[PDB]
């Protein structure tokens, strides 16, 4: 039938060579023959979307920052340092753990971009702190992060899936992190910018979100590619896993946001913002969202942000 | 008579949390208190050096490409596909493997940048092929890569260090890849551009090298940082390992370059160019080069291409 690229079936990627006990002829990535065109689309978009926090003049936020009380400034520093922890987990553990579970050679390196870009997300919060926060505010937020059990329980929840040996459960975790877990925190800068506070910070948040949306979409796309090849029984087991894990993380997120926002009255609103994105996460894995309009209500000024 | 950052010592990075059996309070990276200022310097340089192959007008090489015989075009496609293999190894295995062996939280994410940028290096050869090569030339070269044992033996040589449990040997491998193993191949575009052929392709190579130089420097810096704290016995054992592995890779590289360039006469020149960089690799790990001037001689027109300085991102 004159099949093209027969060498591909006669060889292995380098990570497969390592996994199989140092066996097989290794092939180079072939960027001229992309097995799944979606991989090329995603590579192009994520690399075109490269940014660094220094491009945004956060120093122009100083005037509005100084109109916030010490308590609001503390809330922001704590919230963002908690987001930094989740991005640190995804950059150093979660996205790199997806590399060896890839379906294609191109996907392997796409996840190296995801890991690096999430590292940029984590670096960005610190860039904001360098401009706006005192040394004491920064240090107290770090001490609060390590000592706040509701925060740590969310940080601990997904790590075993990345380290253990079930690639589909690891993939679900890899979609859950960008698709759900940081939105309760992203609510805060959008609430503030809707009120004229910290506009340049919200520009950074929007650059972070532009990356996160693609990370969630792409991990959900790869999840569906593998799950569709399973038996109906195993597909049913995996759907039950996804829903059980999501509901577990929703409960952990609710407890955390209630503590984080207790003095400010933002938790119930932030939780609806979070759960709206939980529904988007489910849809990106091929499932219907069970959440009601009232459970997911976002006010127009927030949705504008 | 007469009259900071404690949280850091009470916590662990996420990688350390996993390494300890899921134990400990996890800390966020602190980009406001950087334990080793070298990490901030390197983060700033590598991110400011971000590039993509779209930066270079590779189609302007078409006129000179068409003056090359089919045999030269095949040599170029094969050479670059072999480099793509080494970059694929480093992007997906080698630099990723350095993440959990880091001394600092900032180093953990620096190696994610290294892995991604080496993926860009591999992507860039593909962009060149898209512009210059036929689909048949591209497929031929991939077939040749999988079937050429001298190339495979080099690709195989470093992988066990990345997956085995000696972090210092893995670090040596991570410096040897950018510091040494691709230079015998980079000789070819520089040879061509010194003669007016494929000048834009050599601009891509110089963007790749600007990254590789830092990857080798930084891995050698971290190697020295760890080794300096070890016993005299262990330091001497590691020096012996570095020289033993380097000499083994030099022998594999000589056999490969002799095969790769056998019809063209370039192997003896490319080998000296390679060994010159072997000496630089040793210096970046704190050792003296044992190689002679004759063993490392590079002609001026080639050295100019190697040394020249490398739309916004
Ligand atoms: Ca409220
Ligand atoms: Ca010669």
Author numbering:
A (entry chain B): 2 to 306
B (entry chain A): -5 to -3, 5 to 311, 338 to 340
Task: Quote the study's own text.
Aerobic RNR (class I) depends on the ferritin-like R2 subunit to generate a catalytic radical in an oxygen dependent reaction; the radical must be transferred back-and-forth with the catalytic R1 subunit, which performs the ribonucleotide reduction. Radical translocation between the subunits proceeds via reversible long-range proton-coupled electron transfer (PCET) in a transient R1-R2 complex. In a recently discovered active metal-free R2 subclass, denoted R2e, this tyrosine residue is post-translationally meta-hydroxylated to a 3,4-dihydroxyphenylalanine (DOPA) which serves as the radical-harboring residue. From an experimental point of view, R2e from Mesoplasma florum (MfR2) represents an attractive model to study active radical states in RNRs.
The catalytic radical can be chemically quenched by hydroxyurea, a known RNR radical scavenger used for decades as an antitumor drug proposed to inactivate R2 through PCET. Importantly, hydroxyurea causes a reversible inactivation of MfR2 as the enzyme can recover activity upon re-oxidation by NrdI. Thus, the protein is not permanently inactivated or damaged but resides in a radical-lost ground state. To ensure an accurate depiction of the radical-lost ground state of MfR2, we solved the crystal structure at 1.35 Å resolution of the protein chemically quenched by incubation with hydroxyurea before crystallization. This treatment abolished the 383-nm absorbance peak and rendered the protein colorless. The electron density map clearly shows the post-translational modification in the meta position of DOPAY126. The two oxygen-containing functional groups of DOPAY126 in the para and meta positions (denoted para-O and meta-O, respectively) form hydrogen bonds (H-bond) with D88. Strikingly, the meta-O is involved in a remarkably short interaction. Using END/RAPID error analysis, the O–O distance between DOPAY126 and D88 was calculated to 2.43 ± 0.04 Å, a length which could correspond to a low-barrier or single-well H-bond. In addition, DOPAY126 does not interact with any water, nor with K213 whose ε-ammonium group is facing away from DOPAY126.
